[PDB]
Design a binder for this molecule. Structure first.
Ligand SMILES: CCCCCCCCCCCCCCCCC[C@@H](O)O[C@H](CO[C@H](O)CCCCCCCCCCCCCCC)COP(=O)(O)OCC[N+](C)(C)C
Ligand SMILES: CCCCCCCCCCCCCC(=O)SCCNC(=O)CCNC(=O)[C@@H](O)C(C)(C)COP(=O)(O)O
Ligand code: SF4
Ligand code: SF4
Ligand code: SF4
Ligand code: SF4
Ligand code: SF4
Ligand code: FES
Lengths: 262, 112, 176, 360, 108, 44, 94, 109, 112, 208
């Protein structure tokens, strides 16, 4: 008992329910994304995942609607593409010109999404908002301003670290994912957000500035700080270790890593 | 399946022996014409050694292919192609010694 | 379209025959070319008097590198490090570490003219327009180790020439 | 004192290019091409930028095409000057050399002026062309071009009639018009044996549709005819310059597609997408659709040929480079048997070969 | 400046090494260098053979020109402008002018 | 060197119109501010 | 640069160089130039652009294929034959 | 067992005392992308790399550290190295398990 | 007659027509052994007989080469000469099978 | 969709298509498939044994008077049952157009040389021989070019380090230049530019 569904053309005997996103993931075609993340939770913000139904006139978020009843879905449909350009211009309407200095610069997902889909000409012609920093702890280097409110990190905190100290604040523009009140946020999974953070809005202070992503070689191995034995990708800029990242593995770390080890 | 040259081993081994005859006899001429000051024996021995280097190859076509790559070199020394440098190259004489003993290697460097 | 070079052939007319024969015996075209080089003896020589005079160049011309400062006196370079990432010879090597103030900076920007090909990709690449391919074109030197410029060396080159470079960029940037 | 067989051994300058190209992204591979047929530095770049634009399915704004042809032609003159000249120097004429390299230097004043380098001007881009050329240039090219013809003409007075020069090169080294084709001779080495073929007229790639010029066919196939082809093609290029000067439209020069052409500096410094595409164009570089092709254009020595295969990544997978000289030099020993040892020297020169291109 | 290109090392002294070097080529280079009369010099030129330059990483290049001959002055460029070369050789003369075997020979 | 006055958000470019660092918006008044590369702080 | 010489020079030449004197540039283009302003470009309109259209690289398509033999009738040319060229018109011979 | 060791000019040291390490590369975790993840590649083991006494460059001895090769299938890769007579460390493709997702499960109570 | 010949290797040949008749006749004859199977005999005869029909149709040469649609028929006679040895090869290659072999499908799948 | 994108003529695509069909029928003992690259480049395949007969006819008239090899390229690919993948460009003059036949080859199977068929291919046999392992049968003289003398291992093998395994240097104690393992300084820094997110939906293979 599992429904047939058509990715753009070919039939696919997809699992019952399950999000359109997961359907195309099953055919392997990859929808542009931000706020969604498996091993986290679904959310309707950041509508960069919009896709066009075979017949229904308006696009729907890919990670929202479960597939059913022989649906067909044209990921490559032109209206979908105009939708994606539509959103991307909005995201780039305020993200600060920081690519050369932002430490996320080598592989920030926002860049690549801007390349693959976003219209190249700017046509915003006013003034970006920009906001003061919110100091948070020995580790994470919050910068904000580069923030795009994929709430993501809070969905990280409330649903895995379990701490709910940080959260969204305010409405419209000026709404901020920074925690109100100066209080420092320390937790044992505080390090992994530096991985989880979509852009450069949150990046590790200790590693900061030290290196650039296209440079470092990326050896695979396992942690030793714990006997837990989680898989990792150590990253070295030639003859010297630069930074550690988790390597996903279902039996153990699954995309996460500790913090003392990091 | 198309063979390069000789079918089955042994038919190719004779080729290589022929090749040894050619090299061996040519060698003193090599030392003479090139003004090499290697001991006239040494080149011969080294030839025999190079012949020992692949003295365990066992594939059909690969060995005849080996004598193809073996022809070109005597082909070059006979035409005075290559030079004193190029032909003296085989003796690795400038290299610093590298004992294969575990402990010896062990003191020297990080090793594999 | 297509044209026949040669293919044209001599007339057998006796006046023409005697002309070619007299040409052979009396070397007309020979003395013609000889008269031609005579003619080039009398033209004014083209040589410039280098060093004392120096050849024409262009605002766009490429030469010695030199990182350069803000008018404020602060250095421009911010270690976006893509100068390393776009140089085909990969001459550049950079190793940034944070300022005590917390601003991004290089620790050992360096470059080696031994491998640099003076293509001017670095000149294009810098977002803050820090490194610049300077107008100077002469710095031939005795020893190989001098070629391998350190960061401080580049800054000193940026100090030596700054009015000059700023002049070229001033004269050029609109075309960029 | 007769040769019995010349036995060329190339690879004495095999710098090893194609292996290197594979490791570097498209935009970073471009300079290698100047480093190829270095006497004819622009046409190589043009060959490449065509080779990518077909894969990339993208068309330069017309003005760019007019530059691309224009400097394609000034370079046409460079290689022909160098060819006829040094071929003369090989047989001891000595003088014409110095009379011409003055001019050739005045041409490098132009590469100097627009590109900022005297030569090896990495200026042609896969997207079209780099910086726009300075306002003060075209009249300057005009003023030169009007007066060049006297120079080429005076050269011709020292050579074409100079019957000593005739006798040295007039019965050598003829190649059968079909036999050329079997060896795949290209450019002038074909036309010397009288076959009509020529890529600019045949399979035009740019505004050659819109220029008019007379290709000069040879006849006997002797070095002499090839020489006259060199000269006449110089004059014809000198015809092309006129037309390009007279129809040189205003407009942009890089392609609009920022995904391939980096944003202008005034813009990248003040809008986000601009800066991002800038950044990625220089970091990762542009991707190309996976595919394979063979472009070829009328480089002065012969057709220049690029076979390349995008894997889809930003680093091209394989980029075999046809070198017209390679075939010629292959055909040489057939062309030169039994000839006197000086004549093989002249005949190397009629082959107008450049070993940097042969060894690739 | 008096300098004149004359072929055949035996009638020449200073040696320019323009352009990229390669493996097969190198031994000939060492030959030619050896056959020059004292007081021979050489001049590495361009980013060419100062150290492979553009082609620094290939199997056939021999990195610097330095690794087969004892170079004098370097003239960085790619190509160096001919004038920068000219400054090169003039600098070479301003290095010969500091030569003083006679002063030293008497001293020893 | 001395910080420019502000109230509050304002541009920076390092003063070089298409010659300075790419335009950014510092966002402080009475607080010390910024910055990109230009030290042009807005403590006032 | 004197009449005593230039006449003899031209006569030795048979070309009269004085009309050109191309072997030097006495007074060419002035070096300093007025600012460029420079052209905008075709797609810079803000009112209507969509990269989904203007894109070229996305128009790349897998090669058309025929036979795939792996998985009357009439004869025909790859292309119509090209005509023989007209001969140069203005200067038929050289 | 089509050994071709004699044909390749490779010194014995590097067909012997080192090993290939076939695997399908892990996603960079900073990325949310998946493209580069797929397709086998054939990385070799690291060896020594010290430092230049001058300028501090990472001078290096090993002939072939940077080499890396894509593949379409693992069996092809193993067989590949076998043709070369190479020591190897084949590793499993580790595709993530499919997971259930529900926006409304967030609103159970 | 025809002065010159154009192509340097090309040699002027007066009264082509006879030689032409020997051409097409040698053509049809040497291909006359082709089993009707392969379509080669079909097409090649198709054009051959058409061209030859023009041969009989066009005793004059000056418009004849305006009729064969090929510059200098004097060359294309040698083109046909190439087709003669072509046919000499056609049956050494034998009448055509519906494909020998097929390459493994794992290959020929670009990109990679 | 005009100013930037190339127009791509339908006509040529037609003629090449039909002509591909034309040859496909004339001699189908070996034409595996006659794919037309959409930017007007025909290119039939060949069983490796079948090289001479095809190319032979490829000079021989029907329309295939494609005289002159433009080149003899040898693309490599580590996968596949046979890695090396040879390619032949060709040009016809009177109908001014280019095609591109190509084959495949084992590391060890000796495919025949094609020098006789295209005439100007003598140099290429030597090239590919010294840039690869592949051997051409009935070739008068394969031998090294574009290398040093000894040198041994073929480059362009898609593996095989660009820095190679050797270096020359002059050594005064023996007064001679000599080979020696690379000892390379600075090390070839190796960027990994390649990035996630497939750019090309129009291609992209089935996940399988
Ligand atoms: C009462 C009657 C008595 C006699 C009256 C008639 C006089 C007899 C005719 C006078 C002829 C004497 C001239 C000397 C012999 C000339 C033949 C020479 O030129 O041979 C040619 C070879 O030519 C010579 O080698 C020319 C090369 C000499 C290079 C030096 C140039 C000299 C510059 C002029 C100096 C003049 C100073 C003295 C003037 C007073 C070979 O001819 P060919 O093989 O068929 O084809 C080449 C034709 N050329 C001439 C165009 C080259
Ligand atoms: C002077 C110094 C410069 C030159 C130095 C020597 C030059 C020689 C170049 C090397 C060329 C070759 O070695 S080619 C391949 C040689 N063949 C083999 O090694 C085969 C090994 N297999 C065997 O069975 C061997 O033991 C024997 C000796 C062939 C056995 O003989 P069978 O009884 O016939
Ligand atoms: S990280 Fe934030 S700032 Fe740096 S480039 Fe990607 S988006 Fe622009
Ligand atoms: S915190 Fe990380 S995730 Fe939450 S908004 Fe700022 S950037 Fe997006
Ligand atoms: S671009 Fe100029 S400034 Fe920015 S990092 Fe590279 S070098 Fe330093
Ligand atoms: S000079 Fe040209 S090559 Fe050398 S680094 Fe700057 S850009 Fe790259
Ligand atoms: S310097 Fe420029 S030109 Fe001379 S070799 Fe090195 S790269 Fe080629
Ligand atoms: S993930 Fe679908 S809306 Fe952001």
């Amino acid at each position: 008992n599992l429904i047939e569904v058509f990715v753009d053309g070919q039939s696919v005997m997809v699992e019952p329910g399950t999000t359109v996103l997961q359907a195309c993931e099953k055919v392997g075609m990859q929808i542009p994304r931000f706020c969604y993340h498996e091993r986290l939770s679904v959310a309707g913000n950041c509508r960069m995942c919009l896709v066009e139904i075979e017949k229904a006139p308006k696009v729907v978020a890919a990670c929202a609607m479960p597939v059913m009843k022989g649906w067909n879905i044209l990921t490559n449909s032109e209206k979908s593409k105009k939708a994606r350009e539509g959103v991307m211009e909005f995201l780039l309407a305020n993200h600060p010109l920081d690519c050369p200095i932002c430490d996320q610069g080598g592989e920030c997902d926002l860049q690549d999404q801007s390349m693959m889909f976003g219209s190249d000409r700017s046509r915003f012609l006013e003034g970006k908002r920009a906001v003061e920093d919110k100091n948070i702890g020995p580790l994470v280097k919050t910068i904000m301003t580069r923030c795009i409110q994929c709430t993501r990190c809070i969905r990280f905190a409330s649903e895995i670290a379990g701490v709910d100290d940080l959260g969204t604040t305010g409405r419209g523009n000026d709404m901020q994912v920074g925690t109100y009140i100066e209080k420092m946020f320390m937790s044992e999974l505080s390090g992994n957000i530096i991985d989880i953070c979509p852009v450069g809005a949150l990046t590790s202070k200790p590693y900061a500035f030290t290196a650039r992503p296209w440079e470092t070689r990326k050896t695979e191995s396992i942690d030793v700080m714990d006997a837990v034995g989680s898989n990792i990708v150590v990253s070295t800029r030639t003859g010297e270790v630069m930074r550690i990242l988790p390597r996903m593995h279902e039996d153990i770390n699954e995309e996460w890593i500790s913090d003392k080890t990091r | 399946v198309k063979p390069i040259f000789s079918r089955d081993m042994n038919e190719a081994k004779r080729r290589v022996r022929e090749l040894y005859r050619a090299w061996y006899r040519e060698v003193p001429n090599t030392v003479h014409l090139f003004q090499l000051d290697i001991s006239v024996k040494q080149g011969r021995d080294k030839v025999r050694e190079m012949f020992m280097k692949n003295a365990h190859v066992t594939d059909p076509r690969v060995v005849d292919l080996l004598v193809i790559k073996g022809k070109m070199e005597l082909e070059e020394t006979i035409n005075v192609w290559k030079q004193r440098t190029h032909i003296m190259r085989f003796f690795h004489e400038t290299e610093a010694p590298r004992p294969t003993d575990f402990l010896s290697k062990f003191y020297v460097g990080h090793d594999p | 379209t297509y044209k026949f070079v040669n293919m044209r052939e001599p007339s057998m007319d006796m006046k023409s025959v005697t002309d070619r024969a007299a040409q052979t015996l009396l070397w007309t075209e020979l003395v013609r070319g000889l008269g031609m080089t005579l003619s080039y003896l009398f033209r004014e020589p083209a040589t410039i008097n280098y060093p004392f005079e120096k050849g024409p160049l262009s605002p766009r011309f490429r030469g010695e590198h030199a990182l350069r400062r803000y008018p404020s006196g602060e250095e421009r370079c911010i270690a976006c490090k893509l100068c390393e990432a776009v140089c085909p010879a990969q001459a550049i090597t950079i190793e940034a570490e944070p300022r005590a103030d917390g601003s991004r900076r290089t620790t050992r920007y360096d470059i080696d003219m031994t491998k640099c090909i003076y293509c001017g990709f670095c000149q294009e690449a810098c977002p803050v327009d820090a490194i610049v391919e300077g107008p100077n074109f002469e710095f031939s030197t005795e020893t190989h180790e001098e070629l391998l410029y350190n960061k401080e060396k580049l800054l000193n080159n940026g100090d030596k020439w700054e009015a000059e470079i700023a002049a070229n960029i001033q004269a050029d940037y609109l075309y960029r | 004192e007769m040769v019995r067989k010349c036995d060329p051994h190339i690879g004495l300058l095999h710098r090893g290019t194609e292996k290197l190209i594979e490791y570097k992204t498209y935009l970073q591979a471009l300079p290698y091409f100047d480093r190829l047929d270095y006497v004819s530095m622009m046409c190589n770049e043009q060959a490449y930028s065509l080779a990518v634009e077909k894969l990339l399915n993208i068309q330069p704004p017309p003005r760019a095409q007019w530059i691309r042809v224009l400097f394609g032609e000034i370079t046409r003159l460079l290689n022909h000057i160098m060819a006829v000249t040094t071929h003369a120097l090989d047989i001891g004429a000595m003088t014409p050399f110095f009379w011409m390299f003055e001019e050739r230097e005045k041409m490098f004043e132009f590469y100097e002026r627009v590109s900022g380098a005297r030569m090896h001007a990495a200026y042609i881009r896969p997207g079209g062309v780099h910086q726009d050329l300075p306002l003060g240039l075209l009249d300057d090219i005009y003023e030169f071009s009007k007066n060049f013809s006297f120079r080429i003409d005076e050269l011709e007075e020292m050579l074409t009639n100079n019957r000593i020069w005739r006798n040295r090169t007039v019965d050598i080294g003829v190649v059968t018009a079909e036999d050329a084709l079997n060896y795949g001779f290209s450019g002038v080495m074909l036309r010397g044996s009288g076959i009509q073929w020529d890529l600019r007229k045949t399979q035009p790639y740019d505004v050659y549709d819109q220029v008019e010029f007379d290709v000069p066919i040879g006849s006997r196939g002797d070095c002499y005819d090839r020489y006259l082809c060199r000269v006449e093609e110089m004059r014809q290029s000198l015809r092309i310059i006129s037309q390009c000067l007279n129809k040189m439209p205003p407009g942009e020069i890089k392609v609009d597609d920022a995904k391939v052409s980096p944003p202008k500096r005034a813009e990248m410094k003040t809008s986000m997408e601009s800066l991002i595409h800038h950044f990625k164009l220089y970091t990762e570089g542009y991707q190309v659709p996976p595919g394979a092709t063979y472009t070829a254009i009328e480089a002065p020595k012969g057709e220049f040929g690029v076979y390349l295969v995008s894997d889809g990544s930003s680093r091209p997978y394989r980029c075999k480079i046809k070198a017209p000289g390679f075939a010629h030099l292959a055909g040489l020993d057939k062309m030169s048997k039994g000839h006197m040892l000086a004549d093989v020297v002249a005949i190397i020169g009629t082959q107008d070969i450049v070993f940097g291109e042969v060894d690739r | 400046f008096g300098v004149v290109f004359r072929a055949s090392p035996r009638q020449s002294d200073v040696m320019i090494v323009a352009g990229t070097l390669t493996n097969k080529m190198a031994p000939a280079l060492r030959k030619v260098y050896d056959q020059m009369p004292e007081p021979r010099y050489v001049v590495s030129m361009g980013s060419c053979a100062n150290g492979g330059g553009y082609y620094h990483y290939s199997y056939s290049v021999v990195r610097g020109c330095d690794r087969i001959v004892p170079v004098d002055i370097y003239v960085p460029g790619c190509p160096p402008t001919a004038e920068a070369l000219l400054y090169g050789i003039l600098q070479l003369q301003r290095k010969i002018k500091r030569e003083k075997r006679l002063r030293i020979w008497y001293r020893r | 060197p001395v910080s420019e006055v502000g109230s509050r958000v304002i541009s920076c470019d390092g003063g070089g119109g298409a010659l300075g660092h790419p335009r950014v918006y510092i966002n402080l008044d009475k607080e010390t501010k910024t910055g990109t590369c230009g030290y042009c702080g807005l403590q006032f | 640069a004197t009449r005593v010489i230039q006449l003899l020079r031209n006569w030795a030449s048979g070309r009269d160089l004085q009309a050109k004197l191309q072997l030097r540039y006495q007074e060419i283009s002035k070096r300093t130039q007025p600012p460029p302003k420079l052209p905008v470009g075709p797609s810079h309109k803000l009112s209507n652009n969509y990269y989904c259209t203007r894109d070229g690289r996305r128009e790349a398509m897998p090669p058309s294929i025929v036979m795939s033999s792996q998985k009357e009738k009439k004869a025909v040319t790859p292309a119509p034959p090209i005509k023989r060229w007209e001969l140069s018109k203005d200067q038929p011979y050289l | 067992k089509l050994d071709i060791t004699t044909l390749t000019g490779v010194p014995e040291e590097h067909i012997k005392t080192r090993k290939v390490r076939i695997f399908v590369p892990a996603r960079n975790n900073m990325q949310s992308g998946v493209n580069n993840t797929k397709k086998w590649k054939m990385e070799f083991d690291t060896r020594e790399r010290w430092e230049n006494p001058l300028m501090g460059w990472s001078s290096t001895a090993d002939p072939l550290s940077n080499l890396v090769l894509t593949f379409s299938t693992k069996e092809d890769a193993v067989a590949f190295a076998e043709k070369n007579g190479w020591s190897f460390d084949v590793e499993e493709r580790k595709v993530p398990k499919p997971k259930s997702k529900s926006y409304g499960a967030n609103f159970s109570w | 007659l025809k002065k010159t010949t154009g192509l340097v290797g090309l040699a002027v040949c007066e009264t082509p027509h006879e030689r032409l008749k020997i051409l097409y006749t040698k053509i049809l004859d040497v291909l006359g052994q082709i089993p009707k199977n392969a379509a080669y005999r079909k097409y090649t005869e198709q054009i051959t007989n058409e061209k030859l029909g023009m041969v009989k149709a066009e005793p004059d040469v000056k418009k004849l080469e305006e009729q064969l649609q090929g510059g200098q028929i004097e060359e294309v006679i040698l083109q046909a000469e190439n087709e003669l040895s072509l046919a000499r090869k056609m049956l050494r290659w034998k009448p055509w099978e519906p494909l020998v072999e097929e390459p493994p499908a794992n290959q020929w799948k670009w990109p990679i | 969709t005009r100013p930037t994108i190339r127009p791509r003529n339908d006509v040529v695509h037609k003629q090449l298509s039909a002509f591909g069909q034309y040859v496909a029928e004339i001699l189908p003992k070996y034409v595996q498939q006659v794919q037309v690259s959409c930017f007007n480049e025909l290119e039939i395949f060949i069983h490796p044994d079948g090289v001479i007969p095809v190319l032979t006819f490829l000079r021989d008239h029907t329309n295939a008077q494609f005289k002159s090899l433009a080149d003899l390229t040898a693309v490599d690919v580590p996968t596949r049952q046979n890695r090396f993948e040879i390619v032949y460009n060709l040009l016809s003059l009177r109908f001014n157009s280019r095609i591109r036949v190509k084959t495949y080859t084992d590391e060890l199977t000796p495919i025949e040389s094609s020098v006789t068929v295209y005439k100007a291919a003598n140099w290429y046999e030597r090239e590919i021989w010294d840039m690869f392992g592949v051997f051409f049968a009935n070739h008068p003289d394969l031998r090294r070019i574009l290398t040093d003398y000894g040198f041994e291992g073929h480059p362009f093998r898609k593996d095989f380090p660009l820095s190679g395994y050797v270096e020359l240097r002059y050594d005064d104690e023996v007064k001679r230049v000599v080979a020696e393992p690379v000892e390379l300084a600075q090390e070839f820094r190796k960027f990994d530019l390649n990035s996630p997110w497939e750019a090309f939906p129009a291609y992209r293979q089935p996940p399988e």
